[PDB]
């Protein structure tokens, strides 16, 4: 890992935290009557970064018998400096309607929260039975709009992280661990 | 699993098989000199089903120093049913151009091959440096159109399988193992639906 200046979390540490978060989520919905087909917990995976976190999380939720429905969404920037609001173009939205369902947006990392805040509100306006967010990493001090994730795997400082779905110029997403991109590489 | 007739592959087995296939992919591409930033192997993950296989395969590829760049597309054909609609719908195509790059389509299962045939004929025209496919499961005797994947983790019978990303009406994709869905379970759902 010559391109990394430090290891944040190993695959093992990540695996354990997700399991804890999943047990937590499971307990939290224990009284919502989740059932496959008719009342599953809808996971809205925001591409591309959360693809790895989502794969491991849904399996951990499966361990606690929480029936889920996987949705993947693809968003795009409108252009540079065209929005304050965090508005994004929807290239791929949910396949089914979330109206009346329990929904959980899955993200890899939240910092400014501009896009996640915009997405939260958009889905909120579609009337799901409930709406919450689970983010793997949270750069709490990087906010540009106020926003709180309901479930978070780890809070971290303002370092550029890569690995476990997280990229730098679309490189390193495949690492099993989360590491800090060393400055000399970004330079 | 009450809804399962039987387990085809456990998580451990799938894991074991994915490692061996990743090792082969590494050996086979060694001569291409794949490098991060300038020459990664482009992985085209076919959503939704391929999401899990893709997450575990890219890590296994990482173990063998194969640098990759992920592209996520979305294609639909079965919908809420058990059989091919006979039509393949492109919901989301690649963000970047595949022209001049080494591309590996990553799929969860191939049966009639209408999906992969559709994809190959679309991507081949874009002139990638090379185009290959890795499918987790292959129902070899279910073809409507011919198709031979470059890498196959396992050959299976024509029965409906779920788990490890594979669904029946967008249900069961989260299972850690791959299992055979009982016809009584899908039949009751089919009836409730139609
Ligand atoms: O709260 P923010 O300041 O927006 O930071 C976090 C977002 O940015 C990254 O996505 P990106 O735009 O990189 O797309 P990607 O997931 O496909 O890499 C990351 O994947 C989060 O979605
Ligand atoms: O060889 P074929 O008969 O074309 O069948 C295989 C395709 O059907 C399934 O996808 P589906 O259309 O169900 O979409 P999904 O991946 O979102 O579940 C499977 O994931 C393959 O993509
Ligand atoms: O450190 C970080 N690593 C990867 N993506 C993002 C987005 N915000 N901050 C990031
Ligand atoms: O067995 C099977 N399970 C899920 N999807 C498909 C498509 N073709 N065959 C399938
Ligand atoms: Mg993202
Ligand atoms: Mg990114
Ligand atoms: Mg598919
Ligand atoms: Mg399907």
Shortest CA gap B191–chain A (Å): 13
Exposed/middle/buried for B5, CB within 10 Å: 0-12, 13-18, 19+?
middle
Q: How many CB atoms lie within 10 A of CB B68?
A: 24
Angle at B52 between CA A174 and CA B57, to 5 degrees: 45
Sign of CA dihedral A20, A22, A26, A29: positive
Sign of CA dihedral B110, A70, B18, A62: negative
Alpha helix stretches (DSSP H) within chain B: 11-29, 51-63, 114-123, 183-193
> What residue's CA is closest to ligand 2, atom 21?
B109
Exposed/middle/buried for A78, CB within 10 Å: 0-12, 13-18, 19+?
exposed
Phi/psi for B80 (5° steps) reads: -90, 5
CA distance B120 to B158: 23
In which domain, by residue range, is A172 found? 1-187
Q: What is the DSSP letter of A139?
A: -
Through-space distance between the first and last CA atoms of chain A, rounded to whole angstroms: 17
DSSP-based three-state secondary structure for B25: helix
DSSP-based three-state secondary structure for A18: helix
Alpha helix stretches (DSSP H) within A29-170: 51-63, 114-124
List residues bridging with B74 in a β-sheet: B47, B92
Shortest CA gap A168–chain B (Å): 10
Pick from A51, A56, A176: CB nearest B62:
A176
Q: Residue B175 sits in a domain of what CATH number?
A: 3.40.50.2020
Is-contact A119 A145, C-beta < 8 A?
A: no
CA distance B135 to B109: 6
**Which method, experimentally, gave rise to this model?**
X-ray
Is-contact B172 B154, C-beta < 8 A?
A: no
Which chain A residues are within 8 Å of B54, Cβ to Cβ? 51, 55
Please give the distance, rounded to the nearest whole angstrom, from the Cα atom of residue A184 to the centre of ligand 5: 24
Q: How many CB atoms lie within 10 A of CB A2?
A: 7
Phi/psi for B116 (5° steps) reads: -65, -35
Q: Is omega for the bond preceding A80 within 30 degrees of 0, making it cis?
A: no
Query: A148 CB contacts (<8 Å, ≥6 apart)?
Result: none
Alpha helix stretches (DSSP H) within A29-98: 51-63
Strand order in the sheet with B178-181: B4-9, B178-181, B161-162
Q: Which residue has the tokens 């490098």?
A: B35
Among B166, B165, B191, B183, which residue's Cα sits nearest to residue B5? B183
**Helix (H), strand (E) at residue A22:** helix A11-28
| Ligand 3 near A111 CB (within 6 A) | yes
Which chain A residues are within 8 Å of B72, Cβ to Cβ? 47-48, 51, 72, 74
CA distance B169 to B79: 7
CA distance A58 to A76: 25
CA distance A52 to A58: 10
Pick from A165, A170, A174: CB nearest B61:
A174
CA distance B2 to B75: 30
Distances in Å between the alpha carbon of B150 and those of B41, B51, B157?
Answer: 15, 19, 19
Among B142, B90, B72, which residue's Cα sits nearest to residue B113? B142
Angle at A110 between CA A104 and CA A113, to 5 degrees: 90
Token reading at B103: 């591309």
Distances in Å between the alpha carbon of B76 and those of A36, A157, B44, B46, B172?
Answer: 21, 40, 15, 9, 17
Phi/psi for B91 (5° steps) reads: -85, -40
Kindly provide the b/e burial profile for residues A135-168, where b requires at least 16 CB atoms within 10 angstroms of the residue's own CB: bbbbbbeebeeebebebbbbebeeeebbbbbbbb
Chain B residues within 8 angstroms (CB to CB) of chain A:
36-37, 40, 45, 47-48, 51-52, 54-56, 58-59, 61-63, 67-70, 72, 74, 76, 91-92, 169-176, 189
Token reading at A49: 């970064």
Query: Which of B18, B174, B181 to probe by mutation at the A interface, max A CB count within 10 Å?
Result: B174
Number of domain units in chain B: 1
Q: How many CB atoms lie within 10 A of CB A35?
A: 9
CA distance B101 to B22: 19
CA distance A11 to A175: 9
Pick from B54, B61, B174: CB nearest A68:
B174
Please give the distance, rounded to the nearest whole angstrom, from the Cα atom of residue A112 to the centre of ligand 7: 34
**Angle between helix B11-29 and helix B51-63 axes, rounded to 10 deg:** 60
Please give the distance, rounded to the nearest whole angstrom, from the Cα atom of residue B24 to the centre of ligand 1: 33
CA distance B169 to B173: 10
This PDB structure is determined at a resolution in Å of: 1.9
CA distance B49 to B46: 7
**Helix (H), strand (E) at residue A184:** helix A183-186
Phi/psi for A20 (5° steps) reads: -70, -45
């Amino acid at each position: 890992y010559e391109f990394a200046e430090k290891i944040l979390f190993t695959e093992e540490e990540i695996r354990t935290r997700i399991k804890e978060v999943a047990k937590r989520i499971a307990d939290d919905y224990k009284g919502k009557g989740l059932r496959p087909y008719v009342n599953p917990l809808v996971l809205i995976s925001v591409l591309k970064g959360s693809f790895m976190f989502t794969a491991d999380l849904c399996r951990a939720l499966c361990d606690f018998n929480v029936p889920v429905r996987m949705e993947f969404i693809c968003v795009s920037s409108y252009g540079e400096g065209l929005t304050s609001s965090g508005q994004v173009r929807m290239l791929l939205d949910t396949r089914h309607s979330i109206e009346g369902h329990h929904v959980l947006i899955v993200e890899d990392i939240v910092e400014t929260a501009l896009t996640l805040n915009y997405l939260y509100h958009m889905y909120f306006t579609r009337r799901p039975a409930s709406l919450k967010t689970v983010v793997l990493l949270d750069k709490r001090e990087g906010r540009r709009v106020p926003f709180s994730a309901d479930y978070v795997v780890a809070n971290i400082p303002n370092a550029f992280v890569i690995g476990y779905g997280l990229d730098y110029d679309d490189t390193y997403r495949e690492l099993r661990d989360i590491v800090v991109l060393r400055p000399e590489v970004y330079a």
